[PDB]
Design a protein around this nucleic acid. Structure first.
Ligand SMILES: O=P(O)(O)O[C@H]1[C@H](OP(=O)(O)O)[C@@H](OP(=O)(O)O)[C@H](OP(=O)(O)O)[C@@H](OP(=O)(O)O)[C@H]1OP(=O)(O)O
Ligand SMILES: [Mg+2]
Ligand SMILES: [Mg+2]
Ligand SMILES: [Zn+2]
Ligand SMILES: [Zn+2]
Ligand SMILES: [Zn+2]
Ligand SMILES: [Zn+2]
Lengths: 193, 50, 188, 111, 193, 292, 261, 49
RNA sequence: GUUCGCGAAGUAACCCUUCGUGGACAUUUGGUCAAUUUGAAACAAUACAGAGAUGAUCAGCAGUUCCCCUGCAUAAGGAUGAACCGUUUUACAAAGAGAUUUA
């Protein structure tokens, strides 16, 4: 469906045009499933029209909230160590392509190359032995039958050493306040008043 | 002839109701019977006051 | 916008940029023997290059007989240079034109930022390393050069640019179309 | 699309200076270039009387009419124009002259 | 395909989703080619979507480090007010733009503790959530808007447009009802003929 | 009424021979061929393994006003086209019945929304009013250019030679061809006579007939077929000078033949329409001279 | 049989040899919805068909013969079918056996399967009307077909008699020199619909002529549907054959009432 | 050479010469206008001749 | 092809291989749609016309339409969006005079 000049494409042109109302839903499902900084690549499950009109990403990105806080906290640490020791950080140019050149195809250009290393904190082995095997997976502990229900990925359950280890990584992003008297005239009931 | 009537599974992207346009139609009047306009007869005297 | 279209009409931005590139070459061959060039060559310039702020290339390329010893890349009004760093045979120029604002109009910062970005970029094609980059702010008629010099050009190029910024016929068209848009005359 | 548009899309292979040559050569062959009588919307400042259908152009009535640069040149150098106007009842063109020394107009054929 | 079905072949839609005219337009063309909010607000969403997808393409092609990719996405989501122009066509997005600006002040002055002023902060997770919640609320909007646009293409506009009264036409509609009431009361006082 | 709509009017021969037919209803399918206004498209297939979808082309209102089916648009009784139906009733009532149709789009739509019957649709859809007219059809079955210089052309037409066995020619000259009697009917009569049927595959015979000049010629490939064409024709007419001519015998007509003994080609008959009429006028005397 | 059923149908044009789907450029920008050229004027837009049907050569068995297809291949008639023996539609000149299959179907749609219309197109071109069983073609545009050879007034008719005789049984062929146009009437409508698409945009040259290398440069001939024949020598033939058609139908129709009783 | 028709401004523009425009036929009457229809048709066909 | 049987041959000794033969497992896709001229996009351009109420120049709202266009729109634009600006004869009678009939 690059060059739709034939008469056979007359029905499929109507399919492209009548899919334009569903296109904001395809943008939300694509941007919510965007790969996080510790991921090289991300296989998503898609639903597509058979005329190639629309391609919805048919997944919802669900995470373990203590694991997800620990993953961003490790990249928060890894990016403050990065900006500390880089001699010069080259921010890229926007937009990354010229508007005359078409979006180059995935298979002739992207798929053949080794991706890169992502942002991963090194995870010292004696302090982080319970998480370092599985912390930076796409879906962490997805096929472990005792930590999660299964590959439908709901209702996790951890042990104490794994849970205190994620607690320890998460210290740049945790709450760090334990008494509720800190929120005295600063809770939402005082905000409503 | 006993004929089963079924519905076609529409494509959700193609416009359903392909024959539906915004067109304008004039309609004929179906006048089979005349309605008798049943007034009364005629207090009809009138000067030039009106 | 319409004042800027009337000021920069008839492709003046491109005609300004060819005028500095031509005026540098007329000063390079005037003192060509002390520099010991075999030839100074202005390159074939893409017409979109003069107003392409994304990337650039070299304009004027210097080929040398003996192998030049260049310094560390320093600013135009730098005092001293240590020429013991790199020993190259070929240098380049780039003439950059920008239009400043109230915020970002330090031409010394702009030329250093572009030189340290374009030489580290893989897409921006320079024929050799160890070149200089001349930047001119067309809004504030300021000039600055940032790059490594081999010898003698830093007093030569700063004496040349003081003549160029006053005597360039394309810059005179720029300064006159500003004064007609501004309706300012100079008494006495 | 918009009254004010910052960017007009050019073809990906284009340049301004090579076009100026090319465009100038095209500018000799068109029918719009060779005929230059300027078409201008105007009002007549000096009531008319038609000479064929004796219609009267009230006081100052709108016309889309035709301005022509006259071969004459008032004094050593002052421009002078000739304006033409069609009649509402009949097909007839009436002509002007703009005298710069005597500020009022003087007219000719048809009115 | 929507541009070209409307006969607007003198408008060029770039690959970075910039819409520019290819020639100096006549007035009947400028009236005809005046696209509405639902076209442009759909076009600016695709500009925002492509601009994020292109940075992952730049990362995968080898041109961009993983720290620059995380900084690149953090730059996009905080500067959509100057990289797209989405605010021109739905100015309620000013809330989402000043939310991502206010999140940037919180993130930077916790990221840049004991660091210098520089680019490489890539904690794009809070500003990512703002736009995903903006996309949550304009799915029902643009499905209604573009759905009316496409059915107006396939079917034409309705002929039964009945204009409501407004401040613009209140004095006009007052007289049409006042003249009918006077014409009624006199036509009933008349004896005949 | 969009929720109360009539069932579709389709023929029995459109539906075919099978008992149960799976038909697909689309509530606003195509627009009508006649009134250009939308309707419920029914479409179906005769058998399950068929390869032709039979669509309903017209709406039910246009099918009722004409009393025709929606698929093949023949009349529901008598299964004939509309143009032949309104011509058969015109032979009974001795006045022209005719359904007239709009060429304007606002009047194609207007003419459909009225509840009348059109043409012969009052006669048909009443079985009493249809059957007596069939009985009235049965009584009908109880009845059951003088200025032209043509002399250059008539030298080339044979007109003076005889239809014997002895000349062995490919071409022949057929004259006395009426303005009726199509070109296919003369090739079929010759090919029936020789048994060289499906002649257009092998190209055994090639025939040119003018229909203005009332004359023609037929050329054979393989001259041995020429003696088969001579010998399979029995009846001949001898002109009272001599010079016997064979008769081809199209039903009720008589077509005379003489061996050309060369290939006549096109344009032998005439090179202008005004010129060809005088050759038929030239011949009409020779036919009367041949017979009487 | 010997010409048609014996062999199988042959690929006329290779699929790489098929023409480009975009038309010849008559505008400034191509339009993607309507596959046409937009800006600029409209220039001309009729060209000589590069392809032509050799009826005794290209005919043969196809996939549609074994499947019981009723409809003829449209691009067989244009000389353009790339599928050959793998094509779902028929690749032969219509015969009495073929039109007998189409007898229930020809009333609403042509021999190629395309649906007919209420009234004719304005220039009498296109598919046809179901309201008139038209069997007569208007062969026009002969000057661009001949590439402006003078030939004559009889030769031109000889070309028309040679070409259209291969496309089916013919009722009559009339050529009018003053109007420079021909009228070909067929025995069946299905041949007339077949020969209309076969001879649209073609050329009546033959190779035996010098211009055969420049056959593509011309305009091409128009085969369109013919109007009624205005002379009363033919008008009386129309009501005579309409009379015989009515008597042949009344015999068929009283047997329906005989069975109904 | 025939007279050219006026060009259609819009899509459903009506050729009033082409057809009886919005044919509101008279209501069916009892008095049997059958000989009268023949005589007008003959008189109208006579007028066109 | 798989699986359960039954039979025959060979290796066997009841198992393996071969081919005969009953079962079971699995069961009717798609098309409203064919690939350039002849079944229907439009715009630009050339030429001509030239722009509501008035004396002249301007703001506009509506209305009736078997015109619509842009717009998401029941908001608003489209020249006050356009078209209007022409054509124009009988429910027809009473009274009171001079020529022409008539028979
Ligand atoms: O110039 P300032 O007013 O002091 O602020 C700047 C400015 O951000 P703000 O103006 O919103 O504060 C820079 O970004 P822009 O505003 O130009 O988009 C930002 O740099 P980045 O956006 O690239 O991160 C920089 O912060 P930093 O130097 O840490 O990058 C920050 O200065 P402060 O950090 O002092 O607020
Ligand atoms: Mg308005
Ligand atoms: Mg208005
Ligand atoms: Zn006048
Ligand atoms: Zn209908
Ligand atoms: Zn039927
Ligand atoms: Zn085929």
């Amino acid at each position: 469906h690059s060059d739709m000049a034939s008469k056979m494409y007359n029905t499929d042109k109507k399919a492209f045009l009548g899919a334009l109302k569903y296109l904001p839903h395809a943008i939300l499902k694509l941007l919510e499933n965007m790969p996080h900084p510790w991921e090289q690549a991300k296989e998503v499950k898609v639903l597509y029209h058979t005329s190639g009109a629309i391609t919805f990403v048919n997944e919802t990105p669900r995470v373990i909230e203590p694991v997800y806080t620990a993953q961003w906290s490790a990249t928060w640490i890894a990016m403050r160590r990065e900006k500390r020791d880089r001699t010069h950080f080259k921010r890229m140019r926007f937009p990354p392509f010229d508007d005359d050149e078409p979006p180059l195809s995935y298979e002739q250009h992207i798929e053949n190359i080794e991706p890169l290393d992502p942002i991963n904190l090194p995870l010292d082995s004696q302090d982080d032995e319970y998480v370092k095997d599985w912390l930076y997976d796409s879906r962490p502990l997805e096929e472990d039958s005792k930590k999660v229900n299964g590959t439908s990925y709901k209702k996790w359950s951890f042990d104490l050493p794994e849970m205190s280890n994620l607690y320890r990584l998460s210290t740049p992003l945790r709450d760090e306040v334990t008494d509720k008297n800190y929120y005295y005239l600063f809770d939402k009931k005082s905000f409503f008043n | 002839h006993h004929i089963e009537v079924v519905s076609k599974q529409m494509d959700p992207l193609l416009p359903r109701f392909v024959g539906k346009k915004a067109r304008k139609v004039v309609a004929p009047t179906e006048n089979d019977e005349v309605v008798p306009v049943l007034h009364m007869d005629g207090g009809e005297a009138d000067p030039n006051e009106w | 916008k319409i004042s800027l279209i009337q000021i920069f009409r008839a492709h003046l931005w491109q005609k300004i940029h060819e005028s500095i590139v031509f005026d540098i070459c007329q000063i390079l061959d005037g003192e060509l023997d002390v520099l010991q060039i075999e030839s100074v060559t202005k390159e074939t310039v893409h017409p979109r290059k003069s107003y392409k702020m994304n990337s650039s290339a070299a304009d004027i390329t210097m080929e040398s007989v003996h192998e030049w010893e260049v310094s560390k890349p320093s600013l135009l009004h730098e005092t001293n240079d240590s020429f013991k760093g790199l020993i190259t045979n070929k240098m380049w120029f780039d003439v950059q034109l920008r239009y400043g604002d109230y915020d970002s109009h330090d031409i010394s910062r702009y030329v250093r930022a572009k030189f340290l970005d374009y030489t580290t970029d893989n897409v921006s094609m320079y024929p050799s390393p160890t070149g200089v980059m001349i930047g001119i702010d067309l809004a504030y008629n300021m000039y600055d050069a940032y790059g490594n010099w081999f010898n003698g050009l830093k007093p030569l190029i700063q004496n040349s640019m003081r003549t160029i910024m006053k005597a360039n016929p394309a810059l005179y068209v720029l300064r006159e179309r500003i004064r007609k848009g501004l309706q300012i005359y100079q008494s006495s | 699309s918009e009254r004010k548009a910052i960017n007009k899309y050019y073809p990906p292979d284009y340049n301004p200076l090579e076009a100026e040559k090319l465009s100038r050569k095209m500018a000799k062959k068109l029918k719009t270039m060779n005929k230059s009588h300027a078409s201008i919307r105007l009002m007549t400042p000096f009531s008319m009387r038609c000479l064929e259908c004796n219609e009267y152009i009230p006081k100052s009535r709108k016309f889309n009419g035709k301005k022509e640069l006259l071969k004459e040149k008032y004094l050593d150098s002052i421009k002078i124009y000739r304006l033409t106007i069609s009649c509402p009842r009949c097909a007839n063109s009436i002509a002007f002259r703009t005298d710069p020394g005597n500020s009022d107009y003087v007219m000719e054929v048809g009115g | 395909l929507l541009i070209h079905r409307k006969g607007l072949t003198y408008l060029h839609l770039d690959y970075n989703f910039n819409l520019k005219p290819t020639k100096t337009l006549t007035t009947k063309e400028r009236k005809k080619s005046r696209l509405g909010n639902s076209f442009h607000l759909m076009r600016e969403l695709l500009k925002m979507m492509k601009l994020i997808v292109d940075t992952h393409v730049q990362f995968r092609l080898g041109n961009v480090d993983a720290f620059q990719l995380a900084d690149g996405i953090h730059y996009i989501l905080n500067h959509i007010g100057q990289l797209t122009g989405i605010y021109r066509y739905k100015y309620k997005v000013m809330h989402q733009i000043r939310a991502c600006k206010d999140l940037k002040h919180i993130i930077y002055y916790k990221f840049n503790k004991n660091l210098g002023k520089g680019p490489g902060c890539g904690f794009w997770q809070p500003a990512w959530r703002v736009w995903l919640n903006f996309l949550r609320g304009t799915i029902p909007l643009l499905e209604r808007y573009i759905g009316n646009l496409i059915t107006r293409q396939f079917e034409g506009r309705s002929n039964e447009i009945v204009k409501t009264t407004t401040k613009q036409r209140l004095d006009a509609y007052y007289d049409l009802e006042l003249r009918n009431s006077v014409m009624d009361d006199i036509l009933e006082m008349m004896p005949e003929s | 009424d969009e929720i109360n709509e009539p069932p579709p009017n389709i023929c029995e021969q459109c539906l075919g021979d099978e008992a149960n037919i799976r038909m697909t209803k689309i509530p606003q399918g195509s627009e009508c061929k006649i009134c250009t206004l939308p309707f419920t498209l029914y479409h179906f297939k005769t058998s399950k393994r068929s390869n032709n979808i039979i669509k309903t082309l017209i709406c039910v209102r246009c099918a009722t006003q004409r009393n025709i089916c929606q698929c093949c648009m023949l009349d529901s009784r008598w299964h004939i086209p509309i143009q032949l139906r309104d011509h058969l009733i015109s032979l009974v009532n001795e006045e022209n019945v005719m359904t007239e149709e709009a060429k304007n789009d606002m009047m194609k739509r207007f003419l459909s929304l009225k509840n009348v019957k059109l043409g012969g649709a009052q006669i048909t859809s009443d079985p009493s009013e249809a059957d007596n007219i069939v009985d009235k059809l049965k009584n009908i079955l109880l009845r059951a250019y003088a200025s032209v210089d043509i002399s250059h052309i008539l030298k080339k037409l044979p007109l003076n030679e005889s239809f014997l066995k002895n000349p062995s020619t490919k071409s022949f000259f057929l004259y006395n061809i009426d303005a009726s009697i199509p070109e296919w009917k003369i090739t079929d009569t010759v090919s029936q006579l020789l048994g060289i049927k499906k002649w257009k595959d092998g190209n055994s015979l090639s025939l040119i007939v003018n229909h203005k000049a009332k004359c023609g010629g037929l050329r054979f490939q393989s001259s041995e077929l020429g003696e088969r064409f001579v010998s399979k024709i029995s009846e001949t007419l001898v002109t009272p000078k001599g010079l016997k001519r064979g008769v081809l015998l199209i039903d009720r007509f008589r077509i005379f033949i003489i061996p050309w003994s060369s290939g006549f080609s096109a344009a032998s008959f005439g090179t202008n329409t005004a010129e060809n009429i005088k050759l038929s006028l030239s011949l009409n005397k020779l036919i009367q001279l041949e017979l009487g | 049989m010997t010409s048609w059923r014996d062999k199988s149908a042959k690929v006329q044009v290779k699929e790489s040899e098929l023409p480009s789907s975009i038309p010849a450029q008559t505008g400034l920008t191509f339009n993607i919805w309507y596959n046409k050229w937009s800006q600029g004027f409209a220039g001309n837009t009729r060209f000589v068909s590069p392809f032509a049907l050799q009826p005794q050569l290209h005919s043969g068995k196809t996939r549609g013969d074994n499947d019981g297809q009723l409809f003829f291949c449209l691009f067989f008639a244009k000389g353009m079918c790339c599928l050959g023996p793998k094509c779902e539609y028929l690749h032969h000149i219509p015969d009495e056996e073929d039109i007998g299959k189409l007898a229930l179907r020809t009333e609403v749609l042509d021999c190629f399967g395309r649906e007919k219309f209420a009234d004719y197109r304005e220039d009498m071109g296109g598919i046809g009307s179901f309201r008139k069983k038209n069997k007569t073609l208007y062969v026009g545009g002969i000057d661009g077909a001949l590439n402006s050879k003078h030939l004559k007034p009889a030769q031109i008719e000889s070309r028309i008699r040679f070409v259209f005789s291969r496309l089916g049984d013919i009722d009559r062929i009339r050529y009018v020199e003053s109007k420079n146009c021909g009228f070909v009437k067929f025995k069946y409508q299905a041949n007339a619909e077949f020969a209309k698409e076969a001879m649209s945009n073609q050329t009546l040259l033959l190779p035996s002529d010098k211009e055969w290398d420049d056959r593509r440069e011309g305009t091409g001939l128009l085969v369109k549907w013919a109007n009624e024949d205005p002379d009363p020598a033919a008008q009386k033939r129309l009501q005579e054959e309409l009379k015989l058609e009515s008597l042949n139908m009344m015999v068929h129709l009283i047997n329906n009432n005989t069975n109904s009783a | 050479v025939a007279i050219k028709k006026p060009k259609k401004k819009y899509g459903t523009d009506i050729d009033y010469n082409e057809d009886i425009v919005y044919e509101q036929a008279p209501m069916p009457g009892i008095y049997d206008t059958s000989t009268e229809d023949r005589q007008i048709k003959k008189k109208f066909e006579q007028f066109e001749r």
